[PDB]
Amino acid sequence: LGQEKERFQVLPGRDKMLYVAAQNERDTLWARQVLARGDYDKNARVINENEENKRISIWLDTYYPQLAYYRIHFDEPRKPVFWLSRQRNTMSKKELEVLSQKLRALMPYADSVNITLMDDVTAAGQAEAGLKQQALPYSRRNHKGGVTFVIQGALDDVEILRARQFVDSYYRTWGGRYVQFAIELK
């Protein structure tokens, strides 16, 4: 990979394909272009966290429709970590091993998929803390199966930016399936 060794990871697939793991969309596009140039399109794929999370969510929409979960993390791409709700889980260890097996089959570059339970109260508390940290007025509204944090009042361009970066960061960690943020409209 050369000077690109820090941006990308090449992983072997169970499907005999090669996977290039990228860190963002701009690297993903560029990497796909390089592939589409040397004609490796049929033999290699470029992956990223955001796309893979969307792709697996589609599959879950049809196979595990009532599933209470957060997000998959790929800090170690050969061993992704699937974050599930601790409070809202209904499945036994055996059923969770089945899910993990089916997730592995969907990600040919993954040795295994670890299912890890995450606390809902913690999920919402980390959202609250980040808003308190920036002395942002907000209302926490608890609904059935989620929480909305409504950010209130006017904010300057800097504060609008700093709040958007917090929100973006939160979603990258937790996904947008449980806690959501919104901006007050008056």
Q: Listing from the earlier edge strand, what are the strands of the sheet with 69-73?
A: 69-73, 81-85, 114-118
**Residues belonging to the chain:** 186
3-class secondary-structure state, position 134: coil
Resolution of the structure, angstroms: 2.3
* Residue range(s) in the chain whose domain bears CATH number 3.30.300.170: 48-118
Residue holding tokens 């794929």?
45
| Cα distance between residue 173 and residue 118, in whole Å | 12
Q: What is the CATH number of domain 119-186?
A: 3.30.70.1770
Q: 30-48 burial, b if ≥16 CB within 10 A, otherwise e?
A: bbbeebeeeeeeeebbbbb
Q: Does domain 1-47 have CATH number 3.30.70.1780?
A: yes
- Among the four given CATH numbers 3.30.300.170, 3.40.50.620, 2.60.40.10, 3.40.50.300, the one describing domain 48-118: 3.30.300.170
Q: Which tokens go with 92?
A: 């036994």
Structure solved via: X-ray
